[PDB]
Amino acid sequence: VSRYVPDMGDLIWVDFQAGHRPAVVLSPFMYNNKTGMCLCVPCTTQSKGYPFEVVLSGQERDGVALADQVKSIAWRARGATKKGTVAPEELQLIKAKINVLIGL
Amino acid sequence: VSRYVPDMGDLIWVDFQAGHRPAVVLSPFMYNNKTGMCLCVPCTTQSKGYPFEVVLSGQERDGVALADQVKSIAWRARGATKKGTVAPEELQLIKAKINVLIG
Ligand code: NA
C-alpha cells in the first residue's frame, strides 16, 4: 500500500488531544517525499482579516490560509492526509506574500 | 526599558540540551514587532552536508542554518535574545535556498 505524499498546492489535514487542523503544502513533491517533511501554511475557518491572510474559495464552506505563518512540519510521522488542492491562483497569492515578508 | 525586537538577518537565541537553539530571523522588524512573531530558520553546530544547509562563518567557530526548516515562532512569549547578525551574503544565501524550495 502506498502512502499519500503531499504535493505542492495540496491542502492537507494533520495534527498540531485532538490538535489536528488543515494546511497547504508549499514544498515540491520530491522534497516532501525524501525528508518526510514539507513547508506549509495553516488554514482556518476563522478570518480576523490580517494582511497576510489568503482567502480560500471552496465549494461548500470557505476559509483562510495564513501566509505569514509558513512552517516546516513532518507530515509523514504526523499522519497528513489530503483534503483537496488549491487553485494555482490561491497558491500564487500565498507565495507572493511570503515573498513580500522575505522575497528574493 | 524596551525589549529587543528581532530584525531581518539577526541571529537570536530561543527555546524550541543544545539550548533549544539559535535561529536566523528572516522577518522584517515591523512584522516581528507588531505581531510578536517572526519567521526564522534554526541553526546547529552539527552538519550533515545537506542541500539546504547554509554555512554561517563565525570568528571563533562555524555553524549552519537550515533553510528548508523555516518556521513561524512566537518570540516575545518564547523569549528571544540577540546573539549577533549574519552577513549580508549569508542571509541572502538563505533566502535563495528558500525560494529554491518554493517557487
Ligand atoms: Na524582563
Curated annotation (Swiss-Prot), chain B:
The annotated region (Loop 2, involved in substrate recognition) lies at: 45-53
Where would one find the signal peptide in this protein?
none
Name the Enzyme Commission number(s) assigned to this protein.
Answer: 3.1.27.-
Biological process GO terms, please? defense response to virus; mRNA catabolic process; negative regulation of cell growth; positive regulation of programmed cell death; quorum sensing; regulation of DNA-templated transcription; regulation of growth; regulation of translation
Say yes or no: keyword Repeat present: no
Q: What happens when the gene is disrupted?
A: Decreased sensitivity to dramatic intracellular increases of ppGpp. Cells missing mazE-mazF survive high temperature, various DNA-damaging agents and H(2)O(2) exposure better than wild-type cells. Cells missing mazE-mazF produce more P1 phage than wild-type cells, while introduction of lysogens into a growing non-lysogenic disruption culture is lethal. Cells missing mazE-mazF show reduced biofilm formation, and survive antibiotic treatment in log phase better than wild-type cells. However lag phase cells disrupted only for mazF had a lower survival rate than wild-type cells.
Q: Which UniProt keywords apply?
A: ADP-ribosylation, Antiviral defense, DNA-binding, Endonuclease, Hydrolase, Nuclease, Quorum sensing, Repressor, RNA-binding, Stress response, Toxin-antitoxin system, Transcription, Transcription regulation, Translation regulation
Which positions does the record annotate as the modified residue ADP-ribosylarginine?
3
Sorted alphabetically, which Gene3D superfamilies does this protein's record hold?
2.30.30.110
For this record, the Gene Ontology CC terms, alphabetical, are: protein-containing complex; toxin-antitoxin complex
Q: What induces it?
A: Expressed in exponentially growing cells. Induction has been reported to occur after amino acid starvation in a ppGpp-independent fashion and to be Lon protease-dependent, but also to not occur after amino acid starvation and to be regulated by ppGpp. Also induced in M9 minimal medium and by chloramphenicol treatment. MazE alone and in combination with MazF, represses transcription of the mazE-mazF operon. Fis activates transcription. Part of the relA-mazE-mazF-mazG operon, there is also a second mazE-mazF specific promoter which is negatively autoregulated.
Question: What this chain does, per the record?
Answer: Toxic component of a type II toxin-antitoxin (TA) system. A sequence-specific endoribonuclease it inhibits protein synthesis by cleaving mRNA and inducing bacterial stasis. It is stable, single-strand specific with mRNA cleavage independent of the ribosome, although translation enhances cleavage for some mRNAs. Cleavage occurs at the 5'-end of ACA sequences, yielding a 2',3'-cyclic phosphate and a free 5'-OH, although cleavage can also occur on the 3'-end of the first A. Might also serve to protect cells against bacteriophage; in the presence of MazE-MazF fewer P1 phages are produced than in a disrupted strain. For strain K38 most wild-type cells are killed but not by phage lysis; it was suggested that MazE-MazF causes P1 phage exclusion from the bacterial population. This phenomenon is strain dependent.
Name listed for the protein in its UniProt record: Endoribonuclease toxin MazF
Species name: Escherichia coli (strain K12)
